[PDB]
Structure formats: C-alpha cells, structure tokens
C-alpha cells in the first residue's frame, strides 16, 4: 500500500498538464486573434511586394500616396481596430462607427480581391485560416517555456526564438539536441506543449499533405 503515496504524487504532475493543455484551447478558440494574424500576414507580403521597388519609388512620397487604392490595403489588418480600443475607451463612440466601416470595406476589398488569385477557390484560405491557430498555439507554448526558462542560469533556452524553435521542433515531432528545458519545470509544461503542438501541427500537415496531392 505504500505505492499509493508515491504513485499519487505522480498524478499531480500528470494533472498540471491537463490544464496547460486545457488552457491552450481557451487561447485558440478566439474567432478574433486567429482571424487577425491571417489578415496581417497577407499584408506583410504586400509590405515587400509593392513597397519594395528600387531606391527611386522609395523616395517619391508622391508615388505611394499616388496609389490611393493600395495605401488603405498596405496599412494593417486589425491595427486599425486596435486603435478602436483606445477610442471606445475614450468614449469617442461616435468615431467608432466610421472606423467600423473602414474594416468592413477592407475585408471586402482584400477578401474578394485576394480571392482573385485564381486556380484555387475556397481551398486557399481554409489553409492559412487553419495555419493560424496552429501557429498561435505553438507560440503560446514557446511562451510557456519562455517564462519558465529565460530566467534560468545554465539554460540552453534564451531568446524568444530559441524558445520558439524548441516549440516548433517539439511540435513538428522533430526535436534535436539543442533545445531542451533545464529546469524540470520546463520539461513538465513541455509534456503539455507537445501534447498540444503535435496534435494541432498535425491537423495542419494533414491538409498540407492532402493539398500537396495536387
């Protein structure tokens, strides 16, 4: 009967993970942040797509504004709505409406406009849309360790990259011999990370694979 003491002590460790993973859900179930990184990544592509002409279009201020049809597009995604926060907070509720129309117009423009890049209808959006949550979680994960690893002395994990690397690596089922929690605590939450990152990162590659069958 002594084992119940030793065996139940394990249950505790096995228990935390139940939350670390449960919490990971409450961080990817937001129809928002998910749908916001997507519309911010598609534009970063334009941030180097159209705003990357030689040092002769990068000097003519007149020509960037000249394309008043792109300026609104190459602005943010939600960093327009982000502002809406510092507005509604200042009771400028009147101005809120106008900015709401701007996001409405922007989603119709980009949404439909982008969908004009033929050869894939409704097949290419389900992708990124999904790629979102998938990545978000990994982030959350890397952040998890980040907190419990950055401060540690001799801990191979330092920058958000190094902690981010470990995330992808352990979530892509890859894992090397460079990124690994020093404090058993990191190793702990890690069990959760991968328990999550994997399952998700897999649903990702699942469609990546299928789609790849073209």
């Amino acid at each position, epitope marked *: 009967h002594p084992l119940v003491e030793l065996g139940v002590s394990y249950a505790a460790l096995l228990s935390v993970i139940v939350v670390v993973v449960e919490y990971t859900m409450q961080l990817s179930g937001e129809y928002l942040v998910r749908l916001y990184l997507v519309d911010l990544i598609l534009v970063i592509i334009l941030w180097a797509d159209y705003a990357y002409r030689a040092y002769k279009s990068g000097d003519p201020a007149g020509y960037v504004k000249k394309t008043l049809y792109e300026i609104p597009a190459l602005v943010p995604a939600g960093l327009l709505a982000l502002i809406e926060g510092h507005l*509604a907070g200042l009771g*400028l509720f009147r101005l*809120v*409406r106008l900015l709401r129309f701007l996001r409405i117009l922007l989603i119709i423009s980009r949404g439909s406009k982008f969908l004009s890049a033929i050869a894939d209808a409704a097949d290419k959006i389900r992708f990124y849309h999904l790629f979102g949550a998938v990545m978000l979680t990994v982030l959350y994960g890397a952040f998890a360790i980040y907190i419990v690893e950055y401060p540690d002395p001799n801990s191979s994990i330092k920058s958000v990259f190094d902690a981010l690397w470990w995330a992808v690596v352990t979530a892509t089922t890859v894992g090397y011999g460079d990124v690994v929690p020093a404090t058993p605590i990191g190793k702990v939450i890690g069990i959760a990370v991968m328990l999550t990152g994997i399952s998700a990162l897999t649903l990702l590659i699942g469609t990546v694979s299928n789609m790849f069958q073209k």
Partner: antibody
Amino acid sequence: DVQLQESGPGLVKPSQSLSLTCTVTGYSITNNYAWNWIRQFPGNKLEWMGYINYSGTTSYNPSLKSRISITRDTSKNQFFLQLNSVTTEDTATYFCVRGYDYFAMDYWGQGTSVTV
Amino acid sequence: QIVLTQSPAIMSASLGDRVTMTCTASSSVSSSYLHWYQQKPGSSPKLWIYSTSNLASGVPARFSGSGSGTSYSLTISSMEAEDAATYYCHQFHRSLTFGSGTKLE
C-alpha cells in the same frame, strides 16, 4: 424610444455576492455606446462601478475592481453586475445606463433598492 | 480619480430669479466630458446638459452651461415647480466620478 429595464434582488447577508440583472429594449448591447452600473448611496451620492460595451470589453471603478466583475447575455440582450462580499457600505440604490457620446448616460432605468 | 464640488450642496431661490450652480473640479477637465444630470428625488436620474454647451432633447431652452478648465456652471434664468431637483455634474479625466449635487429647494 430606447429604454433600460433594471430589476434585481434587494437584500443579502455579508460576504455574499450581489447579482443584478438589467434588460434593454429598443436597442442592442452590441451596437454602440457603453453600458454602466452606477449606484446611488443613501447619501444620494452617485458612484460609478463599471461598464461592458457594444463589443464586450469592460472596465470598473479602480477601488471596487478587487471585489467585482460584469458580464452580459449577448442573446437575450442584458448585462450582469456581480459584487463579491457585500458589506454595509454597499447599501444603496442601483442604476443601469446607456453611456452615450463622451460618456453621458442618456437613458436611465427606473431603479432598485438594495439593503445590506 | 479627481474629486468634484457642487456648491452649494443645498440652496434656495424662487420663481423668476436666475438660478445658478457651480461645478468646481479639484483638477482640470475637458470641455467635452463634462455633463449635467437632473434628479427628482424618488424617481430616476436624467441627463440634462451634455458636452458643456448643448442640452438634452427634453430640455427647455431656458438652460445654459458655462465652463472651462477648473469650473463650469448650470445657470438658468427662471425657476418653476419642476426645476426643484438635485442637479449633478460628473466628469471623466482619469476615471469616472460625480458631484455632491447642487440641491435645489
């Protein structure tokens, strides 16, 4: 033609949480403006507790925060006031109001008396 | 955060006289976020003067508001049997607050 319709208990024992319910008609809690919970003490004074808004986000009175929170019934069109550990000081009247432009409750509910 | 002082806390006068009130904020404000509410004891509060210089829909033109920086007023021109109400003035700088109420008798 809008109109807030407040209702609620009105008597509880200390350390017990207060749960208020205010309905809204002729409008929506998601369109625009903010939604407040400003009480009126026995001293006829007025103390603003907090607010949820058209979007959802909320903010409270810097003092009460440590002991309160608020929500809403997105579907039925109502918001909820929640105060934890109601002492004697909390004895007062309660009101829910439409926070119009630059913050200015432009529509007040009739009222409810809460005793502690 | 800041505090409000609605003097007189209580005051009188009668039909005809240009009634006056004053909201003295311990600290500066913002001509916008300054509003006046009228409350008839027993009933429910009712916004009366918004954004310093413009009034509510169901308000008689007899009213007028004057303020800036640290002080604002709710001046009138003539009272009635109705005006007998507790007028409040709230502001919004750091957070939200209200006043003692320039009670009318």
